Design a protein around this nucleic acid. Sequence first.
RNA 1: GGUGGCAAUGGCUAACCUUUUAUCUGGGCAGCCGAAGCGAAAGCAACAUGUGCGCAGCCUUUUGGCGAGGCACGACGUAUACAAGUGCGUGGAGUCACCGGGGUACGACCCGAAGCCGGGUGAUCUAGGCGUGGGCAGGUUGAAGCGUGGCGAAAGCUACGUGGAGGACCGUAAACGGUAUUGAUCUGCAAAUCAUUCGUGUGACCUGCGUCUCGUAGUGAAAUGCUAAUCUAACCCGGCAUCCGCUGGUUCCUUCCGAAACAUGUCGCAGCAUGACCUGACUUGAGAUCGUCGGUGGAGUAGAGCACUGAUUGGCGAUUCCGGGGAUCCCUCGCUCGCUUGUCAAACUCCAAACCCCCCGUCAUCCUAGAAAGUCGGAGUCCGGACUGCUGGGGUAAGCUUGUAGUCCGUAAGGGAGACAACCCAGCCCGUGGUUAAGGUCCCCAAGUGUCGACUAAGUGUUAAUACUAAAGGGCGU
RNA 2: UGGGGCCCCGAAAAUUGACGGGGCUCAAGUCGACCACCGAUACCACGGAGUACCGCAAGGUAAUCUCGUAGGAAGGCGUUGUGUUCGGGUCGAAGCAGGGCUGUGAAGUCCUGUGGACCGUUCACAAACGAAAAUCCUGGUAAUAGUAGCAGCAAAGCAGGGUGAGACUCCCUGCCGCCGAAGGGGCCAGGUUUCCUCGGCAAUGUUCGUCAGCCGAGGGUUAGUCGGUCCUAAGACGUACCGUAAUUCGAGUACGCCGAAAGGGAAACAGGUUAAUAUUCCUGUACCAUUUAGCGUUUAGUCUGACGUCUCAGGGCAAGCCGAGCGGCGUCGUCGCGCCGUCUAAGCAGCGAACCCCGUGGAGAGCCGUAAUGGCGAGAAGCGGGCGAAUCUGUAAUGGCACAAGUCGGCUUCACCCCGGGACCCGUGAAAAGGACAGCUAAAUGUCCGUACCGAGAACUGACACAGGUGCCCCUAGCUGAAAAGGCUAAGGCGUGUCGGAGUAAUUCAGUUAAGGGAAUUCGGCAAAUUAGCUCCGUAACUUCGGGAUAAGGAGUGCCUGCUGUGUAGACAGCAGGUCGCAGUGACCAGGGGGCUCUAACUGUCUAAUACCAACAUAGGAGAUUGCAAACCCGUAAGGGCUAGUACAAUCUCUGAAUCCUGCUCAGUGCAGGUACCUGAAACCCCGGUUCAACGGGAAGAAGGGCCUGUAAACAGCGGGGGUAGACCCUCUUAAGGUAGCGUAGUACCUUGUCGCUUAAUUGGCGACUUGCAUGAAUGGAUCAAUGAGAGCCCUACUGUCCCUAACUGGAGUCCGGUGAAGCUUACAUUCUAGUGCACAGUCUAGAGACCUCUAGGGGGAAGUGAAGACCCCGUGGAGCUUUACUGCAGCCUGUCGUUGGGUUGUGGUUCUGGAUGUACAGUGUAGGUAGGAGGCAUCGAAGCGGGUGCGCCAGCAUUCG
RNA 3: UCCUUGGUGGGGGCCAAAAAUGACAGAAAAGUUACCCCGGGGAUAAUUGAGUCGUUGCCGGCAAGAGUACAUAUCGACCCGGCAGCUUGCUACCUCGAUGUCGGUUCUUUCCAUCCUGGCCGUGCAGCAGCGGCCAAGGGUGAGGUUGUUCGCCUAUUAAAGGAGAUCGUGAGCUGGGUUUAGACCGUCGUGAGACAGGUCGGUUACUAUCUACUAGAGGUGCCCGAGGUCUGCGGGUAAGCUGCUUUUAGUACGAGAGGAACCAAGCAGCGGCGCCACUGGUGUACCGGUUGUCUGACAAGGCAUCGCCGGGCAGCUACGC
Length: 238
Amino acid sequence: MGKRLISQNRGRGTPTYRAPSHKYKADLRHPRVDENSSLRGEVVGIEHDPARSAPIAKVAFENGEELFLLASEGIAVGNIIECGDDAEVKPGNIVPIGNVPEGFFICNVESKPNDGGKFVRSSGVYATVVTHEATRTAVSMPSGNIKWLNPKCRAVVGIVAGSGRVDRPWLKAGKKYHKMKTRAAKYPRVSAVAMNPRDHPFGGGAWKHPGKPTTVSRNAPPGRKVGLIAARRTGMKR
RNA sequence: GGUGGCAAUGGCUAACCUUUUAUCUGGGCAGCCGAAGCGAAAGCAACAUGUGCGCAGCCUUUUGGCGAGGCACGACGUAUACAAGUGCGUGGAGUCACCGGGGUACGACCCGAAGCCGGGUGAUCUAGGCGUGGGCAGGUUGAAGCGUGGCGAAAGCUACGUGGAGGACCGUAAACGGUAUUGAUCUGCAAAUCAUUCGUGUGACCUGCGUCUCGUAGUGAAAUGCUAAUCUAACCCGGCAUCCGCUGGUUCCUUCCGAAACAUGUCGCAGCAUGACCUGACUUGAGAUCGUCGGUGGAGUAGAGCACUGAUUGGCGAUUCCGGGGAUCCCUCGCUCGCUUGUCAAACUCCAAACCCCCCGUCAUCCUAGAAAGUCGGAGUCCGGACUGCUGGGGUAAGCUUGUAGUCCGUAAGGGAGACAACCCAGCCCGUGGUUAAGGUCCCCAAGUGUCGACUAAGUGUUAAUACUAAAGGGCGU
RNA sequence: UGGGGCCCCGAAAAUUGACGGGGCUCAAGUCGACCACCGAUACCACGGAGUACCGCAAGGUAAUCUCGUAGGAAGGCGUUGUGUUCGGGUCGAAGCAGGGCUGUGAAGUCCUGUGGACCGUUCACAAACGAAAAUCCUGGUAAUAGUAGCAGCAAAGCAGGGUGAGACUCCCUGCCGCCGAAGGGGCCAGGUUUCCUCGGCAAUGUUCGUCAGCCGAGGGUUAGUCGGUCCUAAGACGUACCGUAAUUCGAGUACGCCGAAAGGGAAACAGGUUAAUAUUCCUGUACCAUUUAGCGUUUAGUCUGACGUCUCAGGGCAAGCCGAGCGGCGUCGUCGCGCCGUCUAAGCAGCGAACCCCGUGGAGAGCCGUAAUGGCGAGAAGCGGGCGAAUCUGUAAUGGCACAAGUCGGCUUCACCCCGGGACCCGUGAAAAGGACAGCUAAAUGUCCGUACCGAGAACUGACACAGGUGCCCCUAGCUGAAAAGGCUAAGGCGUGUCGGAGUAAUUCAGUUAAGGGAAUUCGGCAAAUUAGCUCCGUAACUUCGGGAUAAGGAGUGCCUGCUGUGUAGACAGCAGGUCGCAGUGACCAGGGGGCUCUAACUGUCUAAUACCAACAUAGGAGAUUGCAAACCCGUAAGGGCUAGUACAAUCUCUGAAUCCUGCUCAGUGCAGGUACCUGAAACCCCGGUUCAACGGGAAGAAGGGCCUGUAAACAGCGGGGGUAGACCCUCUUAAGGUAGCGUAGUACCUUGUCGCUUAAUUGGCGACUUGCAUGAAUGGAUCAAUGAGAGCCCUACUGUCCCUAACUGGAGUCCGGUGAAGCUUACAUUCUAGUGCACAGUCUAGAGACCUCUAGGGGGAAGUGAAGACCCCGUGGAGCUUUACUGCAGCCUGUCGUUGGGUUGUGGUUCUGGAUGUACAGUGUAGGUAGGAGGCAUCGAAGCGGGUGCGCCAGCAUUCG
RNA sequence: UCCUUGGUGGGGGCCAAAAAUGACAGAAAAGUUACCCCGGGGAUAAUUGAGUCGUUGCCGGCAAGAGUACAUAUCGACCCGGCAGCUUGCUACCUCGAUGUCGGUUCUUUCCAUCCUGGCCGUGCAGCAGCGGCCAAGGGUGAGGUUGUUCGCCUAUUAAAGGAGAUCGUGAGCUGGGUUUAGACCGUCGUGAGACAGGUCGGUUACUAUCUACUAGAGGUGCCCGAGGUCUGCGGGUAAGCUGCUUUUAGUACGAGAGGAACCAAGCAGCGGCGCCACUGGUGUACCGGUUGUCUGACAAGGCAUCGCCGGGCAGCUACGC
Ligand SMILES: [K+]
Ligand SMILES: [K+]
Ligand SMILES: [K+]
Ligand SMILES: [K+]
Ligand SMILES: [K+]
Ligand SMILES: [Mg+2]
Ligand SMILES: [Mg+2]
Ligand SMILES: [Mg+2]
Ligand SMILES: [Mg+2]
Ligand SMILES: [Mg+2]
Ligand SMILES: [Mg+2]
Ligand SMILES: [Mg+2]
Ligand SMILES: [Mg+2]
Ligand SMILES: [Mg+2]
Ligand SMILES: [Mg+2]
Ligand SMILES: [Mg+2]
Ligand SMILES: [Mg+2]
Ligand SMILES: [Mg+2]
Ligand SMILES: [Mg+2]
Ligand SMILES: [Mg+2]
Ligand SMILES: [Mg+2]
Ligand SMILES: [Mg+2]
Ligand SMILES: [Mg+2]
Ligand SMILES: [Mg+2]
Ligand SMILES: [Mg+2]
Ligand SMILES: [Mg+2]
Ligand SMILES: [Mg+2]
Ligand SMILES: [Mg+2]
Ligand SMILES: [Mg+2]
Ligand SMILES: [Mg+2]
């Protein structure tokens, strides 16, 4: 058994690959709202989220529950966040995407209604509402894909705060090191061609090279799915 | 195999019972082997002796007779199914022991690895992740920002001060690291230390304690590094007395005999099997051939020769033929074929030995105190080496390599060569006396300063074989 | 002239050597012959042993018997026990040491001594039955050897006096030393009695020892306040649930519970006391918590606990320093200096800086602030108030002090306390207990565990009284000085980094110095030397504009006298004059510098114990997958990692900063998509077979494959020969044929390629050329400032690297006292030469030498010692790793069955009503299925007709609306 | 023939024929290891040693001829015969329970096939100087640049700057540049792991001497009236010297000139050897002085910092001196 790969080590769940969950502020999700209900809350603070490197808003709701929300750009302390099917479609409000006009920017979008918000959550990203239909509503993802969602899926109106985070180059291994201390990701990473053959499919050889094509089949088993996985194509576009 | 019991109307019992404490006595016929074979099977199913030779033994007129066992036939059962031949079997000897040998399987004469696998142990070291603490002498540089001021029509450009940034600089024997001396040390202070010299020293920093991640797993800024002095799969115990054709060892005496280092097959080439060769026993019963001489046969090697096959040298004579040289092919001529000359042959032969081989006779030797033959028990051995020949083959040669005959060493003393595995005498029980062998006789050193006839002037030489000994060539040296 | 013998020339090798040596000349050589002798275990003779065969035995025969490895065969000896026979022994068994005799021998027996209770023997039978060997095992014990070590990193002792049997070594005094930002002080983990006292010295202590962490005996640890205990952290554990064949196994969830002697945290101090404990005992003066009783009660949910890195202001203060008084000690050749002390806890009470807040105020052709950033009509300055620190003041003030003084001032202040500001983050820097906000008075209670001592050059760990590590973890006085560097000194700890003496060789470890030369040394400037602090002047190529940079290169520097400036001060900066030395950063400390290349951008990481590199990483660049019930990955499952995450995200790869760029090739392999057609298993279905099945075919046809398309920042590739001043048409092209660049390279075989600079001379370096054996673009190309314990070359400086060594210093060595190992070893051994021999001999052969013992010395030889060669081969020995090797197994893709139901239609017959609808030729009539080969109905029904209801040749059977 | 019996379908068997194992007396079968491990082997290679000598180095015989003529002053074809073992091969006898690699360095020694120095002979030798050969191994044979080199090239001296053997002498002497481990890069090869007889950067050199040998120093015993002194010399050893330059002979002999010697004589030098310390230089931790920092209160006198550092230096030792 030429040793297991880094991906298999991470799947094992060892401490080297686990997130420092105790360092994080909140499991960001929409407040739980019953069918045909609404809740209002006011923003009391804007805090740094170590798990995302983007601000989060602390919201005190009418029901006596205090919750951390994924902050949209422009959300300010003292703002009244409304969440409901009848809520005004305004930045920071959590409304169903069936009530959002075409061309509006949404974020923290539920995969299914009441899911808590799955898509469009990183700093600066946003989704655009494209079409409305009777049972489906379509949005353009930050990836460019068109996603057909239930119109009852809730989303906060606006874009995610923290835009331009990666415009500043790391410039230095130490800065990225400090970012990686709060993440599960292993830093730094050794290239596979630099490893021995017992440690990677690409390892070994008198000189550094994979020895086999780096595009691997989608059928390849664990310990073998390395390099370009099921690549449609390779190279820079001609 | 040796020794016994019983014996075709066979032998022996197993478990078990009888124990009155393992014995023992008496039972115990289940079963096994023998008693019928042949055939895949269905199936079918044989001599209580028909003949001959003949050992022992007995008889005998000493040459014969009878002749168990033995040998050779004949006959029969069955398969080959058609036949014909043949195979196997058939005229009652087995069975159970004791004491041995040997094969096979088991740890299998004893010890000797790396490994493979199971279940467990380990992160007091080290690597990485996390929690919570601690630390970084003293200096240097002087980013943005800010203040005031200069040069400008503006655009803008610019000085100083302030400021205190940076995986910034120097630097500590703080801490961490570990360059070079290839210094000390190298049975050390030390199973990695010491001195000097070095790198980092506000950061991807160093570090305490806590905590987590581990064996086909972990950890790794990746060297197969690290995971408790252990890492290209840790450690403990277990599988395990693993296995090996490979290495080492294997313990008292005498006596008798005494090899093979070879062939064929083998994933065979450091092994094994079968055979040759050694050893033991038995059966059988009259010849055998290591040697000679003569004869009947085989020769195709040596040598020789050119008659075949091919090579090979000139001279001489012809092919009015096939062809090289500058229109009557106007005339010049190489091969080709013969008669003489000169040479050859592993794979040429008109010839043709000496050795040798088969057979017959002969002498010789061995043999009833057991020829030849047969059956069975136990092996070792299949790394060889040498000398003398074979101009052995190959090779420039080789103390090379690979054959062959004889003989040796191996496994061979003693005597002699200076010593000498295998060269000479000699194969050797113990003791004594004698005479020789090889070799030697000036001394070392037993026996010749021996004899005759010559040679050598070079200390040549004083060297059987010899892996241990110099040639071609020359000399009015003698 | 030819043929012969012997000799000569031809004829050169390595330690001194070989006719065996001496030597030998009408021979002691050679040749031809001869004579006598010596000389084996051979041969002969005698005697003896065994063997083979024969013989009833007695014995007979052997010229034709007597070597022997592997090996076969026969007979014996011995050990221990059993059955059995017969014995011996305290008048002395076994065993042991030595000896006599017998036997070929294995062995047996006897004698002497020693020993003190058991031992044999016949015939048989057994076995844990015989040792010289296994780098055999266990024990014991040599040589080495009175040898190495008791030196190197901290060179430490001497005098006098004691104690004692004994004194370098134990005690005291003095002198001389060591550490003095650690070798002192405090304490964690760890140790576990080592602590203290007395008594000892066999061992331990690297010597001694009267000493001791050693030995023996006794003693020693006192808590409401110090810790643990309490809280929670990362993270464990338990129960339950669920999984698992099962569990002591497994993730998650729920509930609990643990997890910090360096995080959070209720509260105590000073002095004294012991031999050893002391915030613990005692004195004095305090404080906290709970329970109870009385006196009163919510403000309730907030705050606190509660937080990063860097930087800075203000205030305080332990330590430190200065002047005066007082009290001691030292010095006293002269002087009047130097040192020590001049004290004082918690608690209690009082004041309160900054920040913040409140009330006034009204500030701009601008004012107010700060070290700095700043602030302001959204209300500055100014003026009042509130809240609120460290610390300070008093009290505790009588305790300790030589009941000696004990009284004052000033300066500074880290490395500690308080307080406030600023900057940075793609990094955001814990939680919970507890506490505060309403408590006051009294009484009672405060259990449990630890507590000695070391905390390391002797108390831990590394086998050690170990130069390592743990821990330099946290602390540290004066001068110099930037300083916690280094040096010299306190306090404190030591002379135990536990052998001494002696002073005399070589050699050696580590240092000092060195004429003249100056890298000639060497692979190479390795090593050493040079420089060195601070101030000022001055500083190049190149550059990413940041730097290079301390570039380079120059000048100054001490002491004394008198001053100037800045500043609140501490101090800092500067000037003038005088002056000494070889030298003023005088010691200590403390860069040598420069030029041209290769390479990697850089800081960083690494082979713990031979590789600190150009390797790894890195930021940057690019590609790939995935919309989250995702991609990727772990698990047998239950369930998980990534993930408290969500495309400017995670994961998977490649390349490796910047700068200029990154060309052509999709034939092969890979990947992706498409699947027209081909291939493609099982099940279902159909056919045949089978009284049933097995079975043989057919149809249908998933994934996969063929096949087509895309894709190179996927793996990869980018070629041969000849006509033309070696370009250009063709080729060979079985995808294409090297673009930009670079080029003899870290790649270039030829090769020390050619030329130029560098040198006297350069297989060198650099530059150019380049026919590139075999360069080339993210298998990244070229290039590059800065950086580098990286690799080469050159210049300068420097030098013992060298010419060529010398002297000197300390430690070893040498010699003496004490202590005291280990490693090689079959034996013998004073060798040397040659030969021989398994061809590399101290031992063999022939010579030559050699009297023995001891000491010192460097290492010629002992093919010296260490290690069953790691190179090579062999083994039907392994291991890891690779793959289009063989064979499998996971994972994954897909068909079928089960889970698995209900409706709607579209596809096959399942099952059958109204008609028997059936008809070459002509029909009166439709075969009314083959037919009793002929024989029934009918006005109570049989037709020629409408689109002709079944149908059909607008005919005619069926009585039908007529 | 198929398990109680009969039958059917389907099986099993007997004899023969076909289908293949070519590694052909028959496994269904790819690599890699320098990260390697274990068992062995001198049964078998790298290295030293032995043998051999094709090859290598050095010669010889006959002399074909060339040499204005003339084989033999000089050169020496064809063929033929050798020596050495210093090149490379061949071989597998020794060694795999290890005989430590290359090159250099240091020190000692040997060979002669002689580079110089000494003596000779020939010449196509006037002299100078050559060319060829003979004897001769006493002495000498050096310094540098490149390269790890050996080898070779080059430089300037030099009388000349010979070659080879000693386990390719010499790692219990040194060094570690090269090769010959583990890391990494480039090129090439391979699908790959990995490889290369390319290149490149980096990469641990163990031991207390038992015996023997040698270098020196002692104690004995032998010899011997007892002792002492002075000698002798069997023997051992030596390189105790070797070699240049200049002057002179002499601008002479010789030679047409140009050029240009030799015997004898002198001095100096290089290297070597032995000794010495008046001189000179070094050292000189005796000693004297100056001075920095600090401590002992100051002065004075002292301690410490490498002898603190700096300057000077007698004796002694020493060479760079004699
Ligand atoms: K890994
Ligand atoms: K990487
Ligand atoms: K013929
Ligand atoms: K204590
Ligand atoms: K780049
Ligand atoms: Mg793999
Ligand atoms: Mg038939
Ligand atoms: Mg400034
Ligand atoms: Mg530094
Ligand atoms: Mg086991
Ligand atoms: Mg055998
Ligand atoms: Mg012949
Ligand atoms: Mg013979
Ligand atoms: Mg043998
Ligand atoms: Mg023999
Ligand atoms: Mg003999
Ligand atoms: Mg034998
Ligand atoms: Mg023994
Ligand atoms: Mg000190
Ligand atoms: Mg002692
Ligand atoms: Mg707890
Ligand atoms: Mg001493
Ligand atoms: Mg680097
Ligand atoms: Mg790299
Ligand atoms: Mg050089
Ligand atoms: Mg490209
Ligand atoms: Mg084999
Ligand atoms: Mg590797
Ligand atoms: Mg091995
Ligand atoms: Mg040596």
